[PDB]
Structure 1
Amino acid sequence: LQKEEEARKVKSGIRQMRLFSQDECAKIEARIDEVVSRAEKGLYNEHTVDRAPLRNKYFFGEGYTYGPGQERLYPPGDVDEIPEWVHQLVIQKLVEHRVIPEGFVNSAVINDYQPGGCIVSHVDPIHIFERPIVSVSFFSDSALCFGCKFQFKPIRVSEPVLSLPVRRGSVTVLSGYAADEITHCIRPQDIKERRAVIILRKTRLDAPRLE
């Protein structure tokens, strides 16, 4: 009853919509490849690009470091600016369809996942970002899990509280319980081929920031 209770609460904090056509996804995917190519040309600030074995993260607008839960924003202007293509192909669409207000987004993060890549249980850092958190999926379909104890106590529990499909061209909006009161993660098994995501957020005015 506790897990079936949680699932409904999680769903209260999730809104999803298919906003980007296949043609729109293809253009955005070409732009994501341009970013990856620029990074490999050493064209971005050091704090803009975080390379890890099965995921690269690209920080535009604002970036942060990641004891525990002591993430801090970099000083303003440390990471590269949000590309014009993010503003005009992605943010503009979200603003037009009333997902978030004009002027809300000042952070765009691109996560580019290898096959087998994943996200280990985490909560979007509530001391750094406002809600809602907006995620847009590219390249391939995947699944976003909520309630990720199964990643750490496998003998005791094997399944997430909820598994949410996240398809190519889908916009996921997280707020409330889904953003603040439960962990999420991505299982290696749900990233069988390259998948990328663009995360659009608003940093808090009072967010802790390195000087």
Structure 2
Amino acid sequence: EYEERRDAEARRVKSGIKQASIFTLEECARIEAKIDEVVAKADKGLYREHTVDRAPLRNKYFFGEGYTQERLYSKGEVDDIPDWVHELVIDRLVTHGVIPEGFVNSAVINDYQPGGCIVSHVDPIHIFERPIVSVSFFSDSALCFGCKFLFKPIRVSEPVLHLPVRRGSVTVLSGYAADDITHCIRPQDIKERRAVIILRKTRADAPRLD
């Protein structure tokens, strides 16, 4: 086995993955321009503090709700979801039946430089409802599931599933793929700048800082 036990788990992950395109590349370029405006605005220090999280090779921009055992920030700590995210992204996904109207109340933009990554994690199940929707921009990459980020020496273990995410791809995670296995972006899979908009609903009973 191994091949079979691994294909077996890959099938479980796949059962919780739905992908779509919908956006044309022209439509992507327009959204990408707005993402660049967010980056420029943040660089000028025009946002609330907790909206912007800067890391080596990766910035995160939190709108609607942000979090930091994870807890939501108090209300009013992060910026509102920009009108363009509603108009160009969320509304399109609603009209296409990907998510219900009124579902999304959190939008996070991750912006990666080449070599940037995000370590294996499960989107906090006490904070976020499912499904988790993401839309990718600027360049093609891949989302990996089940990788372990190891040390001595630094390495990433073999993925249970490697899922190509092309520019303009909509990725919807639910069930096993969202709850029972981690996902990550490996450094080797970010060769050019890539950004992604993650759209989520927070749970009514999500714990929140005072």
State TM-score, norm by structure 1.
0.94
SS in 1 for 2:35: helix
* Rounded Cα–Cα distance in structure 2 between residues aligned with 1:148 and 1:86: 31
1:85 aligned counterpart, secondary structure: helix
Structure 2 counterpart of 1:195:
194
Amino acid at match of 2:96: H
Q: Residue 31 in 1 paired to residue 30 in 2?
A: no
Letter of the aligned partner of 1:42 in structure 2? G
Q: Distance in 2 between matches of 1:144 and 1:90?
A: 20
Residue 113 of structure 1 corresponds to which residue in structure 2? 112
5+ residue gaps, structure 2: none
Corresponding position: 1:6 with 2:5: no
Separation in 2, partners of 1:156, 1:195: 22
Matches within 5 A, 1:2-151: 2-65=5-68, 70-149=69-148, 151=149
Identical residues among aligned pairs (%): 83
Aligned to 1:171: 170
What is the alpha-carbon distance in structure 2 between the residues aligned to residue 14 and residue 31 of structure 1? 27
Q: Does the Cα contact within 8 Å between 2:156 and 2:186 map onto a contact in 1?
A: no
CA deviation map 1:39-94 (0-9, x unaligned): 011110000000001100000000001xxxx0100012210000000000000100
Equivalent residue letter for 1:117: G
Query: How far off is 1:186 after superposition?
Result: 1.1
Matched position secondary structure for 1:19: coil
Q: Secondary structure at the match of 2:26?
A: helix
Output the CA distance in 2 between the equivalents of 1:105 and 1:10: 23
Q: Distance in 2 between matches of 1:81 and 1:156?
A: 38
Partner SS state of residue 8, structure 2? helix
Unpaired runs of at least 5, structure 1: none
- TM-superposed CA distance for 1:2, in Å, is 2.3
| SS class of match (1:31) | helix
Aligned counterparts of 2:150 and 2:89: Cα–Cα separation in 1:
35
Over the residues paired in the alignment, what is the CA RMSD in angstroms? Answer: 1.5
Q: What is the CA–CA distance in structure 2 between the aligned matches of 1:170 and 1:97, rounded to whole Å?
A: 14
Q: Deviations over 1:116-150 (max 9, x none)?
A: 0011111111110000000000000000000112x
- CA deviations 1:93-113 (Å, max 9, x no partner) are 000000000100000000000
Quote how far apart the aligned CAs of 1:152 are: 2.1
Deviation at 1:157, TM superposition (A): 8.4
Change (3 A) 1:49 1:184: same
- After the TM superposition, which parts of structure 1 deviate over 3 Å for at least 4 consecutive aligned residues? 153-158
